[PDB]
Amino acid sequence: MAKELKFAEDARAAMLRGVDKLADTVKVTLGPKGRNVVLEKSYGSPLITNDGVTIAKEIELEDHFENMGAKLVSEVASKTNDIAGDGTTTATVLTQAIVREGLKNVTAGANPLGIRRGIELATKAAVEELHNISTVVDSKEAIAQVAAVSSGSDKVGHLIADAMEKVGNDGVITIEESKGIETELDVVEGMQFDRGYLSQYMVTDNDKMEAVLENPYILITDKKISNIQDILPLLEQILQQSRPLLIIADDVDGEALPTLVLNKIRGTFNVVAVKAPGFGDRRKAMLEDIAILTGGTVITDDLGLELKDVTIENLGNASKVVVDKDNTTIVEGSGEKEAIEARVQLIKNQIAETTSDFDREKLQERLAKLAGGVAVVKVGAATETELKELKLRIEDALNATRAAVEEGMVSGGGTALVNVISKVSAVEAEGDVATGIKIVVRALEEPIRQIAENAGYEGSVIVDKLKNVELGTGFNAATGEWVNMVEAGIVDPTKVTRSALQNAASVSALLLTTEAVVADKPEP
Amino acid sequence: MAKELKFAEDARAAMLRGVDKLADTVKVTLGPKGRNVVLEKSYGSPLITNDGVTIAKEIELEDHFENMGAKLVSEVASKTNDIAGDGTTTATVLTQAIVREGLKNVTAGANPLGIRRGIELATKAAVEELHNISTVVDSKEAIAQVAAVSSGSDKVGHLIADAMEKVGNDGVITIEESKGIETELDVVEGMQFDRGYLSQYMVTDNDKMEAVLENPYILITDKKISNIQDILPLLEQILQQSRPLLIIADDVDGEALPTLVLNKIRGTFNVVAVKAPGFGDRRKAMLEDIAILTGGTVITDDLGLELKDVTIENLGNASKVVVDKDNTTIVEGSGEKEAIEARVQLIKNQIAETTSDFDREKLQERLAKLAGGVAVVKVGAATETELKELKLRIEDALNATRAAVEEGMVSGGGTALVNVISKVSAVEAEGDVATGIKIVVRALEEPIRQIAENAGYEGSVIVDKLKNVELGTGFNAATGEWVNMVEAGIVDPTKVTRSALQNAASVSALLLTTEAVVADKPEP
């Protein structure tokens, strides 16, 4: 339908207007003293919240160009919302500030390519500085503290610590609801691999996006399943058993996939199909590993097994299977422990025998996945509301604990961002590159200033005083007192801040170079 | 519907307005330092890109006459985007410049026929000059180097070189996805002929427009298939076998073609029908060759074989068949090697015996097609994303390698266009012919000037300096330094530039002679 193509600064003007609307909607919730925002709902009472990501999701502007800007910034915040729950907001604020000042500078000349180069250089220097100054979190006690201190009550700290030690740093940790009143930690034989669901229609938990199967049947095969006829007898058998089915194949497509999607939507079959991890000869390796762990059999042409000949016996079994968008987790496989041990010993022998560091690394990955097991956290509480609250509290606590483990810990409340201003200013450049460096230097103060303003304190005073105080001491927005953030517990993960900064810088660079916007003309 | 008959200059004014809108949308992406353009999408996040052809495709204007201009220029770029990926943009810029200046000259007299004649003469002289100055690319090392450029990592250069040597200049080279991690080159018995699919509904790969069949059955016949009843038993047999079917006939039309199209759309049959290459007694020659290569049998009235009597045995077989819009490629035919060798020897004897250079050429074409085989590139990589990226990188690398092989290699960045200005100015003409010559001379500077402006440098300064530097040295837009483009690798294939220039000149000549525009009146 007819476009409304537009060039020069007016397109950028509308871009900026949309971004400003979204930023003014979101940023007021930033910081511990964030103010509340009210969202309209089609049915029921309206929701009042200060959660940034939800508000950003709910925004949709009538103006097509402003809607374009809102969608852009929302998709930017999406790339960071995964870790923690605050990195989806600072990115928006930084993006708004950078875009505004860059547009103003470009209006007066200032070749945009130089601005983009300067922004990238400043961002790289800032990332390097952030990785430089950081409280490395690797001690068990420090990890337990960090887990508990953020939101993890107190017991969650020790629980996460013990599970993290037992399964390792990359070990799989799962959270479950215990029927009792006590939360317990269990380590069992399990399998998690980077293969998400083939479609969102078979998602069991819409809120968590994850597909949850309890005591499901597991189909293990290296063949490609494009025909639903190849599995109809097994489908009928499983329907007779009325149990969930997990499908692990090379690829499920064609007519079989829509048929299974329709059956799942209608509730006829609780079936989930995912792609087989690995490729080539490697794929059969952990296919056999999964077969051993679950007690099932890999359906491959090498063994002379056909899809139509698959019975219930050949199917793998497990207590629980969790499938997210990108990974599939298996809990308590029904395979024999001795067979799993033999497979582990075989992989260890291969590792001791292999000479290729790549092949050794892959075999080590398989060995760690097989032997590390899965940590199971059976959360127990007196009431279902208590159980749900504890589950939610444990989830983000675990996420933040992992984020701290990989990268580290730095000063919270945006103090780290100001702490790296000097290094960025130390970067040498000329012309538009220097202009972009100054742009980033000015914009880096936005989070702390905005937090101070939200608490009623003058932002400029806070910024100036922070620039002249000792490193490690910032501004406590909750109390208005200058204390040690590390001692006061106002700490944020390094990964969150660096990811937000990288995303904001990249997207601002992309937007500043925009010259023509093609949009759909509103229908009269 | 109602028409909006409009004549004289205002019709050309609207023509120019539409062309100017499209050119202003497209040209900002020209050059290595091109700026990004944002396109709206009905669903999902808006797409940001600097790819010219996609942006040109997405443009649609509400004004009917401006829509005429946009569609015209888009169809112009259509003839050029096939080779490489940049010739779809320079043509638009040149067309815009020529149209604008020609309209301005025509407004003040300047009989348009003289302008068209002058434009054609200047374009012919420029094409001759471009064919004059060029780095001929025929050495194996040079071909491997050129292939190693583009993106073509480093291994693609050697792989393309070896396949090209093995199959020859016109030999068929195919790209496949190896299940392993390594990319391998294979030469097999194959068949490609200039016969595309009969309809786009049976296209398996919409993105590549190509029809892909894996281990398909091949129907070989010289008869015309207008009735679906003639093939129903064979269709049922193939449906029982659940394999793809390839149909090679004189013509498939009538009721059989829509029936097959509907079956393919519904997924009932993975059938593809194409016309038989060759005509008269010649057609049966490559028909028998295809039957020998695939192991099938030609269904012809000479042999007493009827369409309803065709069985699975008489059908040709191959590992893979690729059908594009204009050509059909067969990979790994199942026919006996000895029979193919006997056919090759027979064709060689015919060549040594034939006295007609036309018949000898046709027999030589058959012999080379049969004996050269098909180069198969089985691309292997660790990840599917890596495999897809490598496949895409190899595709355009092969296309550019062939384009350089046929024509040659010249300076990139539009330097070659300026390098031929002197020869065009040397063309002698008078009156409107000379006016058109000056028009083309002025317009030829548009690509380099636009590229310089996109990088922030003054276009006029760059043009003037380039006109006075030694041949072979141009302007590096990436760095702003005057270096040797051949040494610096800023090189563009001769075919791309000459095709863009020819298309732009022809279409501008057609447009400048327009006097009346008939367009549908918008419905109130």
Add this chain to the structure above:
Amino acid sequence: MAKELKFAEDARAAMLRGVDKLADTVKVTLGPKGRNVVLEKSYGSPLITNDGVTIAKEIELEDHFENMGAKLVSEVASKTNDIAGDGTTTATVLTQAIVREGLKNVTAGANPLGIRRGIELATKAAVEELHNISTVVDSKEAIAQVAAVSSGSDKVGHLIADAMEKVGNDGVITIEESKGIETELDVVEGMQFDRGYLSQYMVTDNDKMEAVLENPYILITDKKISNIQDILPLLEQILQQSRPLLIIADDVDGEALPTLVLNKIRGTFNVVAVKAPGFGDRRKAMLEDIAILTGGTVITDDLGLELKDVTIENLGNASKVVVDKDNTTIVEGSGEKEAIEARVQLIKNQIAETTSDFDREKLQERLAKLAGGVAVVKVGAATETELKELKLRIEDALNATRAAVEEGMVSGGGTALVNVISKVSAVEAEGDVATGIKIVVRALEEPIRQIAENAGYEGSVIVDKLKNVELGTGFNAATGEWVNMVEAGIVDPTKVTRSALQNAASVSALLLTTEAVVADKPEP
């Protein structure tokens, strides 16, 4: 008050619109077959005429910029209407054509300075060619014929021939109304010098703009008259005599000039004051000559004569004095013939004695002015209407006769303009210079084409046929037959055509270079 500054082409658009309006109003009267235009008058019946200069004078446009164009072209025609009565129209037509085509060319580039250079070169070449081809009119019989042709009655030819044979080509010829019925030619002692009236308020003949005095008193002095008190006794004496007074002084200014102007307006004094011809010691030379011719005395400080001491006796006397805007003519001075002869002999001796060619030339001018006398044409007729018609007929006849005498005679009806097209096209130029040459070549056909169109004949056919006929044969618009214009009497003065062409070219060059127009904003 407020301006309405406007730049670029729109100012030139307004200028072109105004010029086009004026040209469309004027050019319709061009040619012998010209049509009649009707003008409005405040009182009485509206006047219908085909006289170009009157119509151009009456034009006044409400739009300010179009008014500027009309005033410009009118001031151009002003410089040309002085000679003959047709050169005030061809200039306008040529100006319109040149301006239109030049504006159209400039709109599409074509640096205006090159256009102006080309126009000037073409005009210079055309003027040279016109001076090349011409029928030189110097024979007495040819002069008499040229006087006879046009209107010239028949006797006026012989009368003018005898007159300018007696007084010379540059001799002063005067026209008077004889009380009898016969027109008579008389040669008397007179004096004409290039000194017009100091103000238009003392003009006696408004229609002829000339100041006419019958038997006036002549004041001859070299002093400057700024005080009216210096001449009050003489003014009273002349008022007692009730005769006109002529004042010849170095300069009359201050309070005396407005006082004399007021007296003349009120009719109290029929006084005219003009500046003294000559400068330095030279001025007193013709001052003494005038005193001798008129019988008066020069009032100078050398002779000890004061302005207040001037009496009636010291004043010069003549039968008639005619004062135009630029020259003052004295008829039948009352000075002694013997004294004039002695002065003439003295000047002849000085000429024979002087060695400076400049001084000899000045003395020769004085001698010719003193000795050649003044030709007096006493026109007689039966009725006053006949006398006035004959006077008017003799006036323009004499003017055209002089114009032919100085320059020559060429083909009329615009034929001469086309006859020089080949030479103009032969001028070598490049770029915008050549473009301006083509502009002038195209525009030179406008007069003949317009004349043909006014008579109903197709202009293009006439132009094409005229370009291919022998020189000296043109198109007779009156009859539509191709005859010899010289034989048919369709002849125009060379001076008229060349002056019109020069004025049109100069003004077109000035207008084409216009870039900003400052005009008075209309009052709301």
